[model samples]
Target: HMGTRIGTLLGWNLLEFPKERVRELQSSAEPTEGSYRNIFDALAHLVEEALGHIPHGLIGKDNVVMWPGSTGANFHLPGWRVSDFVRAPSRARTELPTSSLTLVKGKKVFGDGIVGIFPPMPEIVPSPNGWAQVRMFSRRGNEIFRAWKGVIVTHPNVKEPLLAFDDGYGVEELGDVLEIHAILLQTQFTAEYTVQGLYYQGIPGWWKHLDLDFAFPPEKSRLVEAGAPLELLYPIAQYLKLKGPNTGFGGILLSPKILPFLGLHGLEDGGVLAYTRRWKPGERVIFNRRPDLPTGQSAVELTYVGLSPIADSVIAHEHDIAPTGADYDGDIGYVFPTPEMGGLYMPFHGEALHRKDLPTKDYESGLHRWAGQVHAAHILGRVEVNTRRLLDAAWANGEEVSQDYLHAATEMIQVAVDRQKRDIQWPDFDFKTIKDPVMTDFWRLAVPGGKLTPEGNTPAAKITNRWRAWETLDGYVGHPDMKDGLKPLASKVSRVLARGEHRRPGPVLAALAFALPAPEPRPKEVEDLLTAGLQSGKRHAVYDALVQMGLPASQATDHPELWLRLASKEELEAVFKQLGYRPAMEELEEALNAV
Candidate 1:
């Protein structure tokens, strides 16, 4: 819902200053003294070297700026953006009756006049390190304003001002801070607003962090023109309380400089945010709470198969997962986190960086960390890599990628105890797939001959009735080995459709049986209908065949040839005697017995 800690932003954006802000010029390099009334002046002088160049000395409080650059401040500060809050001019001044409250309400502060005008008043908190900290606190539902509260710090060995404002939050004392040496900096705070008239998120150019002068080479890192209305985020504070700054899965940071322009590519409101996770080289991202496997193990790929409700609206949870490997590469395009997509924040911006790892082999005095999986900065690692491999391949074949995200995944599989199974097979094991409600539902019905959840041994009952309810056979028909499946598929359709002694059947499936060509009669049927009768339990088989051949209904009641075709010689001869057929000579009888 928000970036920079909630308290941090509350300070910089919602609190109002008591009395108009006053500015003062530093007489010398030494620290200047002032009463609490000079809090804004103190903030301004804290970076005197940066803002001092202004011909008029300084822009007094109620004054505004976007970056530290105007002040030309050599150092950088977090949340020190020259950003401020402005009152939205009184809504109405109608002199209506004091109908509700006790009586005569004085000039109202804002909107309904319920919340009194609370101009921010600074409280100077001194430090053991030396300098004083200027703070204007705003919290709870009262955070409708902002101000700058910062301090100065220097290195222990080489002393001098290292940085100002945002850095002050991390520092404890004020004395040893000024001679801040051995430091680095970025574009100043004021730069945040210099570019866009409305608002912005981060700097978009090259700068130094130590001697390393790096650049945001991609399109997003560049400054963007602003057109979107200043998004009025009401209920944002409440939203972050659920997953916000200083919380699990954390609040997202958006680059107004980059995101507002996403409409050019595709999704209109589809925005992008970066998750700057610092990991060490070779370390991969994973989702295990506290994996017991030894370190050096590559990050395990996330799959919805083993987990429930693990929808993948961000990255394809079932796509290609590299096996036991590591590389410096990371996803570069904008990918959402499956956990965050869909509802609360659709098209919420994000990044999953392979960030820095905590230094030191042994645990430090006081520190904590938990490594896990992520999205966006899942930027699928790098876009070029994805394009060359998957995205590229899709285009070459004249097939477009699925925007619906119905990506294919493999299931590595159980079965019925059919060897009598008691004549049955019973169920169950297994990352989940990033499937849609319809697709998952479709597959849920039949596969490995079974149910969507852990149920009977139906592994696809020979599945999943094997996964009979598939979407367009269009997907299946394109398969190169489609023909090989004809037999098994036909078997499942029948067994499933039959709705038999061991079934979950249906009229539709039963009728489907009509679509198939009548199968060529069994080879055993070629011998004689009587043989079929003996083996398959159709006692009347031979009789029916003979009757159809123009014989009377009882004509084959004692037919010698019919008996010969089915029964053993002893039974045949015994049957002949019972049916009163004439006795034969020795040789003929032997032949008859053999028959």
Candidate 2:
């Protein structure tokens, strides 16, 4: 181990070094008076370089994702390359029964005249003793801050993944692409074990698109020619944007299915399932390959299969909106109507509603307006409830409501509501007292091993806002036996949330609780009203496109036969000729037809 804990040895921490200092360090070898930084600095320096590259990796000109690298170091998105990572020996890292770690690096650090970064050879530790613990670290301004203060245990569903230094490394494999493991430790991010298929590998040989997202530094002015291969596009753009070679992270999608398309034959790997298209696609081809390569481009990019957008994507889908390479440039699925009039992202970090570009013809289009309406609704809902929560808070602690932000949002909401034509009743939320009246005796459960939660009050588990406590409990409790007996339930939930250290297992209830019964047979309107997976932005696009063709989003969803999938170019051309409009750019076509 380099003792290289991300600049742990250096007096300065991480990319914490000044750009001048970085320049000074990079210009020369280990200097005579050098205070050598750690891996964090190395990683950060790499990212900064990629950002300043030529052509530049611009995640579209609008709604740019302002992050150091396009890597999945923190946000686990597709095309996420986690490079130069130095995992601590203390963490209890998990591995599937058949999973094996491999290191990859390309022949040229910058392939096709672009820079690249590779994934780390993670330090997987096993818990030898009966009890194993995990600890995490992350970089702050100039220090390797401890990310966690508690024990992160192995996922319960996994067999003895927790081992000590002396516990020994062992491999047991029946197959690859598996694991339904759950953890008994911190419940926050652990539940994702229900769907963790993280089988990341390096780029395969003979891949068409070789570039990746972490290629270049962000160049706002440059318009990256759309419709390029993702692998080729991401790396060069990133190399341009990141100023390259030094930039770290981000690579291609790696699913086994993609292997067949990589122009390689007899490529059977118990390990390598698909693409990694790393910047430095390590010439570590452990997998067998064909004698000759496929002719021509070797690939045709996939497009969204639909002509009309399915606007209700978000509403219908039961999954989360994770990040992807498309997100880096706001170029994924549905182009947002607001901050991203024709793009897929709405900068999560900046202001969208107050943009000055709202007056532009393209910005003023129905797409932009629809997106604005959705966002406006989101803001109005978030602010209004928190504001109305003021009354509940006032009732609990006796403070006046702060309607400053709320008042401003009212104007925004009224206009959006009229345009969108969705009549939403107020009060989707109320900050009620944190008590459910339908429960058994509350005070009797406070003893050791009793049903009552031994509250951790004070600066730690102190619930200052009474209404918030109640609301939190209400979500967990669902429905109580007696609607009036909700206070204890609220109190229980507040106690758990307000804990000094929230990482441990959650608190328990004293009595056997009774919640609202599930619908034996769902109500008549329930089954009929369930939306097909659709987001408002996509729905709006479809709706507008339909109206343009003398149809509606509603009609598109209701009439299965009317729903349109992208046909061949000729079919698309015929439809466009009849509809009187067609996307000039193939990328727009790609985005619209994207599944």
Q: Residue by residue across 1-595, what tens digits does model 1's lDDT show?
A: 2112222222222233233332122111111112211432454443354434422211112323222222222122122222211112111111111121111122221111011111111111111211221222221132212222321111122122122122122222122112111011111111111101000111111010001011211211111111101011111111110011111121111112211122212212222222323222222223211111111111232322111110111111111222211110111112212222211111112222222232223111100000000111111122212222232234334453342221111000001101101111111111122222221122223321111122323232343233344323323221122223333433333332332223222332233234323433333443466566667887556655654454431223333223223333444344334434333223222322331
lDDT per model vs. reference: 0.22, 0.23
Give the clash count for model 1: 91
Cα lDDT tens digits for candidate 2, 424-476: 22222233333432111121121111111222222322323322334533333
Clashes of 2: 80
RMSD of each: 35.0, 30.5
Stretches off by above 4 angstroms in model 1 are: 1-139, 142-476, 500-595
Give the lDDT of residue 192 in candidate 1.
Answer: 12
By TM-score, how accurate is candidate 2? 0.18
Query: What TM-score would every model get versus the actual structure?
Result: 0.15, 0.18
Q: Give per-residue lDDT, candidate 1, residue 506.
A: 35
lDDT for model 1, please: 0.22
| Per-candidate total of colliding backbone pairs | 91, 80
Candidate number achieving the greatest lDDT relative to the actual structure: 2
